[PDB]
Amino acid sequence: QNLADPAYRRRRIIMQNMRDEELAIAQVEEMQAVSAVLKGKYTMTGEAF
Amino acid sequence: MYTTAQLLAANEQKFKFDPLFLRLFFRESYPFTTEKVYLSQIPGLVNMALYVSPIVSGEVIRSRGGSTSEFTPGYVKPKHEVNPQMTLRRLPDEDPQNLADPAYRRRRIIMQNMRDEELAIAQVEEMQAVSAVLKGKYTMTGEAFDPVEVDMGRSEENNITQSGGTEWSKRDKSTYDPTDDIEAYALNASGVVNIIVFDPKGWALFRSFKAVKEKLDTRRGSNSELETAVKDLGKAVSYKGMYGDVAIVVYSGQYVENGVKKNFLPDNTMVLGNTQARGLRTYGCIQDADAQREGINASARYPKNWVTTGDPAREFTMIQSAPLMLLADPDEFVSVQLA
Amino acid sequence: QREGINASARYPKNWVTTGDPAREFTMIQSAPLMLLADPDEFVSVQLA
Numbered sequence: 001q002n003l004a005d006p007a008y009r010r011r012r013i014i015m016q017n018m019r020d021e022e023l024a025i026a027q028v029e030e031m032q033a034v035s036a037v038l039k040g041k042y043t044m045t046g047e048a049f
Numbered sequence: 050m051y052t053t054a055q056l057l058a059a060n061e062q063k064f065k066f067d068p069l070f071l072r073l074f075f076r077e078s079y080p081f082t083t084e085k086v087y088l089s090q091i092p093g094l095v096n097m098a099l100y101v102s103p104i105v106s107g108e109v110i111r112s113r114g115g116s117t118s119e120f121t122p123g124y125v126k127p128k129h130e131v132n133p134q135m136t137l138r139r140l141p142d143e144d145p146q147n148l149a150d151p152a153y154r155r156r157r158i159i160m161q162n163m164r165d166e167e168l169a170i171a172q173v174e175e176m177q178a179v180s181a182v183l184k185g186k187y188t189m190t191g192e193a194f195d196p197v198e199v200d201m202g203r204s205e206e207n208n209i210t211q212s213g214g215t216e217w218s219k220r221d222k223s224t225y226d227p228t229d230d231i232e233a234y235a236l237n238a239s240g241v242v243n244i245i246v247f248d249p250k251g252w253a254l255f256r257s258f259k260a261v262k263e264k265l266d267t268r269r270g271s272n273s274e275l276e277t278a279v280k281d282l283g284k285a286v287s288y289k290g291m292y293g294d295v296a297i298v299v300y301s302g303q304y305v306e307n308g309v310k311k312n313f314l315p316d317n318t319m320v321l322g323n324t325q326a327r328g329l330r331t332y333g334c335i336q337d338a339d340a341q342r343e344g345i346n347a348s349a350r351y352p353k354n355w356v357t358t359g360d361p362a363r364e365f366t367m368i369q370s371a372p373l374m375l376l377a378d379p380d381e382f383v384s385v386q387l388a
Numbered sequence: 389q390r391e392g393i394n395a396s397a398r399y400p401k402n403w404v405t406t407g408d409p410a411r412e413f414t415m416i417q418s419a420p421l422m423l424l425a426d427p428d429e430f431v432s433v434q435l436a
Contacts, residue, residue: 005082006334007346014414018400021416025398032422040427128408338410357406367408 123371333371
């Protein structure tokens with residue numbers, strides 16, 4: 001009932017993207033601590049690393 | 050060596066281009082903001098109220114409507130080069146008795162390139178307009194672009210072809226009268242007709258009949274049509290004059306392919322049209338990443354100049370748009386294919 | 389490195405690529421190195 005220009009969608013996508021990137025960073029920052037105080041050892045391994 | 054040669058003005062060599070369609074029928078242009086492009090045409094047809102007396106009041110009437118069509122995409126972008134190493138020499142302009150720095154030359158060639166891109170966009174638009182008011186069906190296709198078909202909604206009565214045994218070619222050149230054919234073709238026009246634009250060669254056989262002699266056919270016969278012809282000069286349009294209630298316009302516009310010229314109109318066609326027939330010069334949305342940053346998503350044209358990094362530095366210039374020429378009512382014209 | 393952000397928690401960066409097909413990216417950069425000063429201060433019992 002109330003559309004918007006195809007420009008404002010770009011900023012909506014941009015802020016949603018920043019939110020997802022921050023969430024992913026905060027999520028990868030937690031597995032380190034979980035493994036650290038769950039086993040005493042940790043491994044940073046994966047493709048292209 | 051020791052020459053000291055001064056240069057006068059240089060030629061232009063503009064081959065031929067006079068639209069007459071983006072200036073006579075498509076005077077209205079509205080931009081897009083959404084994916085779909087609706088276009089409705091209410092079927093106005095009302096009955097009478099013959100006799101009913103104010104004692105036995107009866108039947109009621111019906112509301113109307115029921116037409117809709119969508120013509121979505123459109124697109125075009127003629128990118129050009131900047132020639133970073135061509136500015137060290139001298140152009141055919143810039144007379145050799147007053148040179149200039151190789152910086153202003155870059156600005157001049159950029160302006161020339163932008164003008165060429167604008168001309169290319171205009172020539173693309175005119176092909177769309179010619180297909181639109183020539184067949185009622187358009188096809189946008191080409192390399193690196195999937196075909197898109199726009200079915201205007203034209204009926205089959207407005208695509209009369211002479212094919213048969215009576216076209217014109219085997220009639221008498223001195224006694225036959227083609228005005229009755231004109232009336233027969235113009236009866237199913239859904240509007241008054243006063244322009245019958247011919248082809249540059251389709252006008253040859255039309256003048257062959259002697260019935261045209263009684264017609265005015267003078268260089269000064271009209272006011273609006275003559276004024277528009279003066280506007281669109283360039284030796285591509287020749288307004289012959291009146292044919293009664295209808296004017297004669299010979300449109301010989303040309304568009305350039307990869308390297309060759311081609312005619313906008315086929316060999317033998319005629320179009321029964323209206324001077325006030327409303328047509329849409331509507332425009333699409335620029336789906337470019339850089340364009341959306343400045344909020345120029347909806348625009349008729351979009352120039353853009355940028356430069357690439359690296360050891361060889363090169364500039365570029367581009368003009369993006371999306372012409373999707375349209376008509377409110379396709380049935381306002383009659384396309385007769387002569388033979 | 390040009391703006392002296394050699395040491396930071398996160399780093400956002402938005403950049404658009406040139407060329408006829410244009411696209412803009414946004415990226416977050418960091419280097420989490422979660423460390424425990426005293427490893428033996430915990431006992432992880434794996435229940436069954």
